[PDB]
């Protein structure tokens, strides 16, 4: 197919495969035609809603084979990451709900246990599928159940350390489970997995349904750790995607620069000025936007695969020799290198900059990818310099400030673009520990840590509030907070991070320790997992738009 | 091979001539076997004097000599994994006559440490970091045009961690010029197929105690290019027969030549056996810490429900998550400092899904001579900001058992944190019964000052409270917090004091701060806890005093605040 349908294709057989037992009723002769229907409805429905695209086109036949040959949902099927799982959803009672994909109150971006009994594990972060399936298998065995346990994992996901840990452990307990390797990013692998204790079969053609069905059949009942190697084509069945798998990894349905592009430009600009700079990403070159950097400074660019943990200790090692590494990494994925950041960087006070993207609410990918916690989990770590730029110009300057600082520094910023203010093309740092009064008013002061500043300024128009662009969580601008506490009736902290442990709480700690008893209102993300929606809707829910902030401030003021 | 530890200093005229590697490299190969025996004698003596790690260093006496003999250290970079085997390395790097200060306040640290010496390229303690660190130094040196060598020594156990696999793959990708030495002491003297497949030139296994083979092999490999993997085989406790015979007992020892209560970890382990006796669903998981966390008895009684995942904290937690999906009841036994490494798995695979998994967090707080690399300083801070977590802090043995029962019965993610060591030895109710969630326990009614204690500083706080006539609350829960008790005390007292063995920043005391601020309660608030720096190693009692967490420290802080 060469152009995505705009009208609901006719799929009479797929309308008979609404669920795995219904599908299993059909005969193998129909499976190939079913795959044409499925592929077609998928291209259609993702045209309607936008979403992940090329990877699910790659697993159409594999997903049909899997539900054909296995007794789902009693047989446990774990999809790694989940971006490839739209065919799975279409085949598990959610075909007609696909119109809701990634809309508020609609189907989630990934498999989700609460969404369907056919989803055994909520995924999004990669590489968790083997560990989870092994755990389900260890339990089924003790329970004397006879269910099967299958993980479909891609070749990128397999570069992650936890996947190695799971494969080793599965061998240790001689677990009866199947790992299917959906190899698409394409010489001689079998002996490796055999050395790890896994029975290796393959590689087989992942769009050759009769061979998939038969091979799956023989392996369904084999015992112990089984490893099937399947090969697929990303975007299979859609030429524009087969030829551009990067750009068709996700499609939007039929302003200023992105913060990540501001970072990428700062990265090239500093590299041109300082040969010490090294750029590190764990398999997120496009998203963190190291693209130009990687083309212009190839010998100083490191893609460590999906190995967040090694990315960080690697950088500690580089800094030991006087190089200046910059680890580009999303807030949600830095969760996975927390120990390397604490033990290998911060404990040694090594000179490493973390450029933390996707900080705050990330929109439709939902809570598995939210950057809700990095202020809280980093600021309790001694030695960290922790920064929250408010716009594009501030991101450029605080990156420069952290880079030049001799020690560990973190700069957090959101997905998407900003208020599109002017960016100074100089590369100069700003004073560490100092906020910027953006607005002198009275009565109530808004202490903003990050990109809600523009909403705070709108609120302060009507309330004539003081507004501060705090810039630093740690070290906090203690002298400004102390003056503001002595001259206002209310301090209001604002952040796109958990309130619990977050930046407002550092203000709170500082007020308590000096016995300053001024009222404090902490605005931030609440203590729950925010359901997927447009970014603007998640922020409105969390009260971090101008109307939410104004309502909270006015209420607190009316109560004292 | 010896059988007794020397009580006075051995005669080591050749080791006395090898006070640094440069001096060592001026000796001849024919001297090295005698140096090896003198080093071993010295090692036995000085660890007998100070206490410290023992058997693993015995295992690397010959390898350490060979390494500093063949490599141009400190210019050539040597990274020791974990570092508990690195006493022979310190003895040879200008520190021999300092080993009397080992693991003492202001003495040598437990592990290699960059600030301690130019011969330590990387601070270690946690495991499996050496290959990543050495690869980064190899990459940097090459971009700088330096011709220096990069060497990582890693034990067979550390190679079970995922980050070691991630580093072995990436080193292959960049075709790095480095040497990984696998110090394998679970084998005795096929075997390299794994490393060969990951792009590494594999050599061995060789005899890690044959200095002539070690020196010649190392010399050949020093000069080869690309990712080089040398497989060496050593014996636990080599050359000291009691440690060869009992390498668990001789992993570490006390200085040569009072009853107390049971260790918190042993209370935990008893709880685990008792609850497994009653609930066939309970499964116990440890990431290679059976002795430390103390699943020994449980492993023997319930072996089909005991899982040691090796040094694989990350997989430990996701494996629990998958177990909980089939209705089983995993308990992850994991140190606070090591749980740092599975944080993404706890957040994304457990909390986000609200799966019923219990975390028994040992080594909460300061851990003593092992130092800041192992400190359990942050787990209240990094867990309480996570939606869905039930976060508990028992004050003594009976409270620890009660709060393990409470977190288990809870259907959802729950955490119970307790320190190394033993407690104040209060009686322990043999029942298995919970307590109510989110409710503290008033231990003393006084006036003016209320001490809100999260954890095991309660006995010291009681001493202060008796001196001041203060109120004392055993809070039990950081999340959900006993908001009603806190509200009441904030109205009836002039000062609230929180005490916890965790970073003040983001800590349980800050949860009290947040609550007061959100309700507009304006009572003065003094937060006592761990300060914003890495506390240098010392006895636990000395580290607590430094931080203000003994009764003297608490009282001085409180009195000082009351004087304004
Ligand atoms: C732990 C973890 N780290 C990073 C990602 C993002 C990612 C990078 C590369 C490939 C993929 C697969 C499809 O995109 C995902 C993740 N999902 N989980
Ligand atoms: C990440 C990490 N996890 C656990 C340990 C504790 C440990 C378990 C097994 C073997 C060893 C080696 C010597 O004891 C240490 C650690 N050091 N680092
Ligand atoms: Mg892939
Ligand atoms: Mg070992
Ligand atoms: Mg011992
Ligand atoms: Na600016
Ligand atoms: Na160095």
Residue numbers in the entry:
A (entry chain D): 33 to 218, 239 to 306, 317 to 622
B (entry chain A): 32 to 220, 240 to 307, 315 to 621
Sentences from the paper on this structure:
We used one of these compounds to co-crystalize with our homologs as a diphosphate-free version of ThDP. The co-crystalized thiamine analog compound (2-{3-[(4-Amino-2-Methylpyrimidin-5-Yl)methyl]phenyl}ethanol) showed a half-maximal inhibitory concentration (IC50) of 197 μM for paDXPS and 94 μM for kpDXPS. As anticipated, the binding of this analog is similar to the binding of the thiamine moiety of ThDP (pyrimidine and thiazole) with the pyrimidine ring stacking against Phe395. However, the phenyl ring is showing a slight deviation from the plane of thiazole binding seen with ThDP. The hydroxyl group of the ligand is pointing toward the entry site of the substrates while the flexibility of the hydroxyethyl group resulted in poor density for this part of the inhibitor. Nonetheless, it is surrounded by a histidine-rich region and shows the potential of H bonding to these residues. Interestingly, the binding of this inhibitor excludes the part of Domain I that is involved in coordinating the diphosphate/Mg+2; the diphosphate loop shows the same open conformation as seen in the apo enzyme. This adds to the notion that this loop is stabilized by the interaction with this specific part of ThDP. Additionally, the binding mode of the thiamine analog indicates that it is also possible to explore compounds that target the substrate-binding channel in addition to the ThDP binding pocket.
